[PDB]
């Protein structure tokens, strides 16, 4: 938003094998990076065995 | 510990400013540079006995 890149997160140990467990939690604000560019596409970096 | 990192950008090329957020081992490196990415970018972990 307006050149500020906001990152939110929360970590939780879970049991469910395939999907989000029924429950609710909120993500913390962490950091709000000052990145003054436009974004419309993105990619995920992954680890490969 | 597989899904490690993200890539952001409008054209995902070396003509438009791009974002790279690498959650590598022991560190997180966030760069905003004119990057020329791989057609299939990723990271690779290799075991040692």
């Amino acid at each position: 938003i307006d050149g500020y890149f906001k990152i939110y997160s929360k970590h939780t140990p879970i049991n469910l094998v395939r999907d989000l467990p029924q429950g609710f939690s909120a993500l913390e604000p962490l950091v709000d990076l000052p990145i003054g560019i436009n974004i419309t596409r993105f990619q995920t970096l992954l680890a490969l065995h | 510990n597989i899904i490690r990192g993200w890539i952001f950008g409008t054209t995902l090329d070396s003509k438009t400013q791009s974002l790279l957020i690498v959650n590598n081992a022991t560190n997180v490196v966030i760069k905003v540079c004119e990057f020329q990415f791989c057609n299939d970018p990723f990271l690779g972990v290799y075991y040692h006995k």
Binding site: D2, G3, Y4, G36, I37, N38 | K15, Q17
Partner: peptide
């Protein structure tokens, strides 16, 4: 102190434009 070396060309506020491609080339 300032007098070639300085250049100048809608955008969202607080944004960068580091592209010099042609907007025929201009």
């Amino acid at each position: 102190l300032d007098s070639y070396n300085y250049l100048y060309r809608n955008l969202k506020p607080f944004e960068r434009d580091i592209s010099t491609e042609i907007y025929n080339c201009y």
